[PDB]
Amino acid sequence: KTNIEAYRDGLKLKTEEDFFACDRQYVCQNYAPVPVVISKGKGARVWDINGNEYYDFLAGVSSLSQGHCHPRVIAALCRQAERLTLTLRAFGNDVTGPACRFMAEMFGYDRVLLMNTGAEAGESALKIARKWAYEVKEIPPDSAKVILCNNNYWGRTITACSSSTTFDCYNNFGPFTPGFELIDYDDVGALEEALKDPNVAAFFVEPIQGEGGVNVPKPGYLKRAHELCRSKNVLLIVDEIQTGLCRTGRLLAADHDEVHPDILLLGKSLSAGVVPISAVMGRADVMDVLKPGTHGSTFGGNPLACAVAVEALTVLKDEKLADRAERLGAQFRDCLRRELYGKVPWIKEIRGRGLLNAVEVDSDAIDPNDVVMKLKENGILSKPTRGRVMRFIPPLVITDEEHRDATTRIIKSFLAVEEER
Amino acid sequence: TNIEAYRDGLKLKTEEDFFACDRQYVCQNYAPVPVVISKGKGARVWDINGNEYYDFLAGVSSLSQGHCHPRVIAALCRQAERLTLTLRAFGNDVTGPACRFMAEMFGYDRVLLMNTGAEAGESALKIARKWAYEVKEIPPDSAKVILCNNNYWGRTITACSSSTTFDCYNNFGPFTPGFELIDYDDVGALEEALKDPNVAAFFVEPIQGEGGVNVPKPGYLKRAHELCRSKNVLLIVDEIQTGLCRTGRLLAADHDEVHPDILLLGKSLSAGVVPISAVMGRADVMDVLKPGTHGSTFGGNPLACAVAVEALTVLKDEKLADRAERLGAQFRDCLRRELYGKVPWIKEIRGRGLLNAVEVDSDAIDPNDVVMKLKENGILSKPTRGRVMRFIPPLVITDEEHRDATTRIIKSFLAVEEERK
Ligand SMILES: *[C@H](CC(=O)CCC(=O)O)c1c(COP(=O)(O)O)cnc(C)c1O
Ligand SMILES: C=C(CCC(=O)O)/N=C/c1c(COP(=O)(O)O)cnc(C)c1O
Numbered sequence: 001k002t003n004i005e006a007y008r009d010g011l012k013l014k015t016e017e018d019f020f021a022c023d024r025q026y027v028c029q030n031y032a033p034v035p036v037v038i039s040k041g042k043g044a045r046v047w048d049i050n051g052n053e054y055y056d057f058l059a060g061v062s063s064l065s066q067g068h069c070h071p072r073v074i075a076a077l078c079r080q081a082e083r084l085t086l087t088l089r090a091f092g093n094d095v096t097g098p099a100c101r102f103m104a105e106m107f108g109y110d111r112v113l114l115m116n117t118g119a120e121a122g123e124s125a126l127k128i129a130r131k132w133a134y135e136v137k138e139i140p141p142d143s144a145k146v147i148l149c150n151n152n153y154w155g156r157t158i159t160a161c162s163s164s165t166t167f168d169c170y171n172n173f174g175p176f177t178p179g180f181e182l183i184d185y186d187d188v189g190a191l192e193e194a195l196k197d198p199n200v201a202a203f204f205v206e207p208i209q210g211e212g213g214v215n216v217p218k219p220g221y222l223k224r225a226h227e228l229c230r231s232k233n234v235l236l237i238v239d240e241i242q243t244g245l246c247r248t249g250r251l252l253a254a255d256h257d258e259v260h261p262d263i264l265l266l267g268k269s270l271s272a273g274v275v276p277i278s279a280v281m282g283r284a285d286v287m288d289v290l291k292p293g294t295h296g297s298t299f300g301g302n303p304l305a306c307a308v309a310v311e312a313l314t315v316l317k318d319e320k321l322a323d324r325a326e327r328l329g330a331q332f333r334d335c336l337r338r339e340l341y342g343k344v345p346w347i348k349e350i351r352g353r354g355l356l357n358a359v360e361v362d363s364d365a366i367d368p369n370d371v372v373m374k375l376k377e378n379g380i381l382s383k384p385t386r387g388r389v390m391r392f393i394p395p396l397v398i399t400d401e402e403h404r405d406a407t408t409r410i411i412k413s414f415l416a417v418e419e420e421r
Numbered sequence: 422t423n424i425e426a427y428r429d430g431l432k433l434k435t436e437e438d439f440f441a442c443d444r445q446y447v448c449q450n451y452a453p454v455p456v457v458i459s460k461g462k463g464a465r466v467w468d469i470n471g472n473e474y475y476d477f478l479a480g481v482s483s484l485s486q487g488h489c490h491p492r493v494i495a496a497l498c499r500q501a502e503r504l505t506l507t508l509r510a511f512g513n514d515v516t517g518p519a520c521r522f523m524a525e526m527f528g529y530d531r532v533l534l535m536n537t538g539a540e541a542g543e544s545a546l547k548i549a550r551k552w553a554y555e556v557k558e559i560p561p562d563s564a565k566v567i568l569c570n571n572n573y574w575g576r577t578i579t580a581c582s583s584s585t586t587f588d589c590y591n592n593f594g595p596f597t598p599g600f601e602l603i604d605y606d607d608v609g610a611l612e613e614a615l616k617d618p619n620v621a622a623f624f625v626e627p628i629q630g631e632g633g634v635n636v637p638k639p640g641y642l643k644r645a646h647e648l649c650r651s652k653n654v655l656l657i658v659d660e661i662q663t664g665l666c667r668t669g670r671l672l673a674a675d676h677d678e679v680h681p682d683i684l685l686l687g688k689s690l691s692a693g694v695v696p697i698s699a700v701m702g703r704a705d706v707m708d709v710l711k712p713g714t715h716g717s718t719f720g721g722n723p724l725a726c727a728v729a730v731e732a733l734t735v736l737k738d739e740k741l742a743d744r745a746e747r748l749g750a751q752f753r754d755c756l757r758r759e760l761y762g763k764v765p766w767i768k769e770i771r772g773r774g775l776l777n778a779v780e781v782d783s784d785a786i787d788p789n790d791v792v793m794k795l796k797e798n799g800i801l802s803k804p805t806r807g808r809v810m811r812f813i814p815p816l817v818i819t820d821e822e823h824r825d826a827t828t829r830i831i832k833s834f835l836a837v838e839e840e841r842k
Contacts, residue, residue: 002496004730008518022517026524028533032712034512041504049514060506076422078498084461086480086693090803092454097442098428104446113448116537116696123577131592142595157543158579168713172551174562177597273506275695276536276719290450293588299696310424383510
């Protein structure tokens with residue numbers, strides 16, 4: 001027994017309520033109450049402390065695309081952990097360079113910056129874009145602007161809160177970092193107007209807004225936005241932290257528009273949910289503005305995380321998970337539309353790409369939480385966003401049989417909430 | 422594993438094969454490195470050729486427990502086979518107990534777990550600001566945070582906005598407002614800054630780390646806390662580098678009997694295995710972070726929690742604070758006896774526990790000569806500010822290893838003085 005096991009045994013926590021109580025007393029209260037206490041995970045399934053099985057339809061908001069506890073990923077983690085886990089980038093090691101080359105070739109970029117979290121990747125991208133704009137575009141000192149979209153989500157740092165339109169994200173956290181211009185998402189005309197400001201350094205966008213509600217933009221949005229940006233020598237920063245890595249049926253969601261972002265951000269399933277590792281990738285003349293001493297991170301690029309990420313990325317390609325997500329996701333949306341539209345009137349839209357799907361409900365006709373509990377009653381764990389946006393984000397490794405099963409279970413949940421209404 | 426297979430395929434034999442790989446594919450934000458490490462164990466590391474060295478950087482105090490500590494690796498691997506990530510959107514059977522473990526060890530009501538040191542600082546600033554607005558009722562957006570010249574807390578834009586280090590902030594603006602910078606180890610300056618009633622907090626290190634292992638005068642922190650209480654100003658103490666037995670005490674703040682209003686931990690909190698940081702505080706302060714007002718994908722993940730509890734246990738079981746205290750005092754006593762006077766270009770020998778530095782006069786010697794000589798003699802070290810040599814070995818360094826190392830360190834400075842003549 002490891003220390004955490006022995007300490008927990010000592011607390012005599014028997015019921016879920018015992019754990020909830022432990023949360024309320026000792027854990028910062030920055031998350032809402034949970035409906036379950038998970039003890040183990042494997043592939044697309046998880047089990048609570050009572051042995052009840054569920055299908056995880058949140059998957060770390062697309063951090064567990066390879067499934068919980070993927071054997072190859074866990075073996076890569078353990079083998080590297082017995083050898084070397086951290087050197088700092090102050091010293092070299094035999095893993096960091098190779099892992100970056102691996103990523104540079106898979107994604108087609110000259111330089112890779114490894115950080116730890118999604119927020120750090122975003123911060124790093126904003127720093128690169130501002131320094132690039134001052135040094136290469138020669139914009140006046142402190143005048144750089146970055147354009148982003150309403151309802152964007154990229155992190156919880158002060159700079160991220162300073163660029164959010166979500167009240168709870170920014171309220172009472174100021175004063176704020178200046179230099180952001182917010183525009184409506186999926187609106188090329190608004191981007192075109194904002195790009196008239198010659199001090200713009202970058203346009204930072206999600207190919208499909210994640211936390212914003214699985215907001216899928218109109219056809220051509222990202223391609224059109226890239227051209228407008230290029231026309232003005234503005235960097236297009238594409239946040240693929242939630243949408244990349246096969247989640248949408250393509251290696252990158254940007255691929256749906258044949259867009260190669262000027263700066264790409266990856267995170268989440270980059271590690272298959274095993275350890276926090278994020279990446280910022282770009283061409284040499286952009287990324288090289290980060291000279292020695294101008295940026296750093298204690299754990300960024302550590303060898304354990306590099307080993308893990310290389311194995312996690314290989315699983316995506318070896319298990320053909322992009323093909324899997326495209327095939328299963330189309331079947332998911334087709335089955336939900338066929339059995340739910342018309343029959344369940346309070347469903348507003350069934351949308352998504354690949355296995356990044358959402359069912360937005362009308363909160364003035366139904367209580368969204370009822371859907372969430374019925375889903376749970378039927379063995380489906382999910383967490384909505386914005387209250388009314390139900391999300392279906394299972395691991396991509398979910399088998400044909402398990403996905404058929406889960407699909408039936410999800411439909412059964414929506415119809416039972418209707419029959420009950 | 423995939424990282425090992427891919428590396429072999431690349432046919433990287435020499436240290437230069439790796440330096441080149443690293444130059445071509447890795448973002449170039451770190452200076453050239455002198456070595457290619459392939460294995461770590463305890464206080465020792467080996468390069469790709471089998472050459473052995475004593476690691477005297479230890480992740481800048483992230484590896485206090487040593488490289489690849491068997492118990493920590495075992496805890497990692499046991500938990501990784503079970504469950505690594507649920508998000509705080511769902512409960513698990515590890516996070517709560519781990520936070521309780523930490524709350525009792527450090528004596529706080531609430532524990533917020535983040536991933537990196539930078540995230541811990543960002544989170545503490547958000548708390549202090551939201552607390553200032555909600556509890557002190559200061560005017561909206563007027564919150565000020567006092568910090569010290571040469572502080573280091575991270576690389577987010579907000580951290581760059583509060584830095585006085587040129588490379589950290591240059592060309593990264595516009596900057597987050599709301600910071601008042603004062604000299605470090607200057608109670609008079611703090612007392613003056615505290616007359617502003619919009620101040621929410623004073624954010625400080627017990628010993629400035631990246632700033633050069635700057636040890637303040639006796640009573641600094643005790644005096645600073647009294648001044649802050651008098652003004653209902655929170656004292657945020659950053660123990661990410663100083664904490665966890667490094668200075669001979671559980672927290673460096675203990676030296677002054679100061680219990681920080683907000684404490685920050687990171688680095689050795691995980692024994693350098695995975696990134697996990699913590700922000701701890703009393704209920705009436707931490708509870709301002711209501712549901713939806715702060716978050717993080719990986720923060721509080723169960724794998725990191727399991728690792729942290731084992732890492733923290735190692736500190737106590739192995740009496741690493743006693744070890745650091747004893748060997749530290751010996752290291753400084755030995756260097757001062759053998760080097761002061763004899764080596765005129767040594768400005769000062771300072772530190773607490775095993776957080777020690779030798780500042781050299783860079784106009785009288787090339788500090789890099791000292792670094793390469795140390796390396797030639799089996800000691801890997803990385804200075805800060807060019808001229809501050811740093812000696813920060815894992816606290817698990819044995820009596821013999823430390824005697825041998827000290828001898829080798831003393832020997833290097835003497836060879837450099839010999840050469841000057
Ligand atoms: C992550 C979004 C989330 O799923 C947040 C969930 C939570 O519990 O906080 C995300 C980020 C931020 O990455 P982290 O800092 O959380 O690693 C950035 N960009 C996108 C598109 C995200 O989805
Ligand atoms: C060692 C470093 C930086 C090393 C590097 O970026 O290579 N300092 C980290 C640090 C930090 C930042 O932690 P990080 O974000 O690197 O985890 C915060 N506070 C204190 C007192 C610290 O010493």
